[PDB]
């Protein structure tokens, strides 16, 4: 007895969930966009020792065709959380238990062939009594794909079972740019491989190396031109760190204009440059004059100043006489949001970005594994657009425990435990490959970056307010945002149908 059903991308499938009602999926997407779905499996009676899973090509009218090479398959790995993330307010974690999060790849990206010799293998796999298994399916729509309807199949098979489900995909007559409109800064502290950067870029996230040795500080950004071409890299940091942080309220004099210009000229031209100058120093009012000194030198070199602090009117003028702010990219937590200050800085030409960590308030989306999966998607797209925010930052992606496939309690502090804090990718060793593999949460971030793009496209077409009415219906602010994946899917489809229509006049 083999029970099969589908689930949407941001639907969590628990090991003990009952079987759903459909084993088909219907999706909609633009050229250059991903859409994903899950195939959940249960053996209500007995066991299946040897379960396999394949997909077809997707075929449309006439010669229209999307190769199965555009589909990426993974088996979900469940991790056991024994200590809850903090429980406060109305946005709560779901409790100790098994959570699907790491993704076991069918294919090693290095070879384009199945891994061999891993401790954990995607297929074949055993389906044991009552504990569900789940396949994650990514579909990347080719940049050139013909608009219209496509269909294909997935096949689950075992020694006593074979079940075939339909994949239905509608390709809309628009494209998402290779270069994401949303800018980002996601920090890598430990895994210095080019495959680590590439895994993040494939998910539309821009990264910077952090905690670099004095020796490797200032190495030349050798690969950046390649990554612009291949992955649409949309910004880069110069790496002048002041060392000022929450614990260190002191700033030295800035690097000279000449030094900043030399750093800038190592990067490709026609690339937005910023400098992450200081972190969470909003309490230290002594630092305002030093921040303006840094700003003036960066501005003379055509470089943007990025600080994780909230807009303060004392820093709306860098002291140069131009009227430009001392901070060009203000990066804030949900809890720091102040509508009036944000309106002031957007009006004068600055950017505001969001960042997240820990569990610091009662109401905002929280980035831990034991929270609703929607919280990783809703922040970069709908809420950011509702509030006029134009980027996202995250402090670390590789904060692994010593047993990273089995222990995801990555931070313990002040009597609190955090599940997945600073960890969005998993090491490949456990699945027999050299490079990192993605999490389910990284897939949600990617999707939210695509949601942002839908809204940006409508803004660019002259339909900003129309798009914000929709955005504000599901994610107006940090307090009031939907917990229901169906409503976000509904909102996205309204946006996508409209763009389709406007491009087919
Ligand atoms: Mg505890």
Residue numbers in the entry: 9 to 513
Task: Quote the study on this structure.
Beta-N-acetylgalactosaminidases (β-NGAs) hydrolyze the different β-GalNAc linkages of various glycans to modulate the length, combination, and abundance of glycans.
Surprisingly, Group 1 NgaCa displayed strictly OR-type enzymatic activity and acted solely on Galβ1-3GalNAc-β-pNP. NgaCa in Group 1 had the simplest structure among the enzymes analyzed. The active site of NgaCa possesses a cleft shape that allows oligosaccharides to pass through to the −2 subsite, enabling oligosaccharide binding and OR-type β-NGA activity. A docking model of NgaCa with oligosaccharide suggested that these tryptophan residues may play a role in a stacking-type interaction with sugars located in subsites −2 and −3. This structural feature indicated that Group 1 enzymes may act on the inner regions of longer sugar chains, in addition to disaccharides from the non-reducing end (e.g., Galβ1-3GalNAc-β-pNP). The increased number of residues could potentially reinforce substrate recognition in Group 4 and GH123 enzymes. These results indicate that NgaDssm and NgaCa are anomer-retaining enzymes, similar to GH123 enzymes.
